[PDB]
């Protein structure tokens, strides 16, 4: 419950309709229900799961940043005292964002990761685990900040090790994972040199493998390679 009474296939069908309607909260709730059926997810289903939550949490993160910026300006010299409301409402949004991250991490831990044996599924779920600890790290300010950062790092690193052993350098999941791990280094771990080196090496190793691909695979890989390039251009 509340998706307990709906057929797994109906949850998946509804998740696709919610995506078409840009109803990402519904899409995420339907995919949560589908995972909770206990069966492993197909490639297409892992994509739906990831898209639903990435959109939900992306909206909360963009809102948190807006409110954080306002709260920071309220704490500058000569800003007029406006009471607790800005902090309260930033905390409300922050708490809801944390709940979403905790829900995704819960799904991964119970029991997506442990039943994921193929590289494409294992690396995908570990990247999500890195990503959702990373979003928790974006808002973390207390005793646990270091441990949350290290949980993001450890998950990304385990996914990196598997992807390097088991997937070609042009695999979209390999390239997406490196893109995100490189962002983690740059803006969470205060290691811009590592972020740059990772984005560079990843781009160049994929460049050299392009010649093995079909036209369609070439399009898939070069799309994410351009995101690596956009970040290198921004950072250098």
């Amino acid at each position: 419950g509340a998706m307990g009474s709906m057929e797994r296939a109906s949850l998946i069908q509804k998740a696709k309709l919610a995506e078409q309607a840009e109803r990402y909260e519904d899409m995420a709730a339907f995919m949560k229900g589908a995972v909770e059926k206990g069966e492993e997810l197909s490639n297409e289903e892992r994509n739906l799961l990831s898209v639903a939550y990435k959109n939900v949490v992306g909206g909360q993160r963009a809102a948190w940043r807006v409110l954080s910026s306002i709260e920071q300006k309220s704490n500058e010299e000569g800003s007029e005292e406006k009471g607790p409301e800005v902090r309260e409402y930033r905390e409300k949004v922050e708490t809801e964002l944390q709940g979403v991250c905790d829900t995704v991490l819960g799904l991964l831990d119970s029991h997506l990761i442990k039943e994921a044996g193929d590289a494409e599924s294992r690396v995908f779920y570990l990247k999500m685990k890195g990503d959702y600890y990373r979003y928790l790290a974006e808002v973390a300010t207390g005793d646990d900040k270091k441990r949350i950062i290290d949980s993001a790092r450890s998950a990304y690193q385990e996914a990196m090790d598997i992807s390097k052993k088991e997937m070609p350098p042009t695999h979209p999941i390999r390239l997406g994972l490196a893109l995100n791990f490189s962002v983690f280094h740059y803006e969470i771990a205060n290691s811009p040199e590592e972020a740059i080196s990772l984005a560079k090496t990843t781009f160049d190793e994929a460049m050299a493998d392009l010649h093995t691909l079909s036209e369609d695979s070439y399009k898939d890989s070069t799309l994410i390679m351009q995101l690596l390039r956009d970040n290198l251009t921004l950072w250098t």
Partner: peptide
Amino acid sequence: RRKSV
């Protein structure tokens, strides 16, 4: 803004 995916 930097890209993630």
